[PDB]
Design a protein around this ligand. Structure first.
Ligand SMILES: [Mg+2]
Length: 227
């Protein structure tokens, strides 16, 4: 695609999220860069308004799959880059097992040289002393995720589903079921993929000099499941 040529080098990234979970309003700003050649993302997120009402690890998937490394033989399956620069809408429902749900709507596109992810997140039905509002999740991401992608030809887009598992402080796990839909914003041709998945590996850390509430993410994502 024309779009894939925008990703041959290191690209600056901005992320902006506005959130409301059970009426608790918050906002996140992120900055970093992506290097799709190696499937590599480095991002730092800062909580900028109301006290973060949910654990940082529950926002990782919401807070740019256009930075996935598609092997050469799988390049015809890369919807995400093909929709650039005009971008795509990415929507999800994230169902937290025995707890509430997030509904997210994001637009991912270039603004000049910079790849931007603008997100609205709405969470409802969360339990007051559950793992999310109770802040009972460990600050880590100890489980890899396979993001299973299929074409959605009717909307000239894709759908995905996957499970993420977040460690609870007692040693147990909080499951998050994700259903995802992406559709192009622009009128250029896009790539409709064969079934495949993104193998996604994330690591969270803290900047020791940062006193604001924040999250540092290092993430490697590789398309797979086609030989
Ligand atoms: Mg209700």
């Amino acid at each position: 695609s024309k779009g894939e040529e925008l990703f041959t080098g290191v690209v600056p990234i901005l992320v902006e999220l506005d959130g409301d979970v059970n009426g608790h309003k918050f906002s996140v700003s992120g900055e970093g860069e992506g290097d799709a050649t190696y499937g590599k993302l480095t991002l730092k997120f800062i909580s900028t308004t109301g006290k973060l009402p949910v654990p940082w690890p529950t926002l990782v998937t919401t807070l740019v799959q256009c930075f996935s490394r598609y092997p050469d033989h799988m390049k015809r399956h890369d919807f995400f880059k093909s929709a650039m620069p005009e971008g795509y809408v990415q929507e999800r429902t994230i169902s937290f097992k025995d707890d509430g749900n997030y509904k997210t709507r994001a637009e991912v596109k270039f603004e000049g040289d910079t790849l931007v992810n603008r997100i609205e997140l709405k969470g409802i039905d969360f339990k007051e002393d559950g793992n999310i509002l109770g802040h009972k999740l460990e600050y880590n991401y100890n489980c890899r995720s396979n993001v299973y992608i299929t074409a959605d030809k009717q909307k000239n887009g894709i759908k995905a589903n996957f499970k993420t598992r977040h460690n609870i402080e007692d040693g147990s796990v909080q499951l998050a079921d994700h259903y995802q839909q992406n559709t192009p914003i622009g009128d250029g041709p896009v790539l409709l993929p064969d079934n495949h998945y993104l193998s996604t590996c994330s690591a969270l850390s803290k900047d020791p000099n940062e006193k604001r509430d924040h999250m540092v993410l290092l993430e490697f994502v590789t398309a797979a499941g086609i030989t």
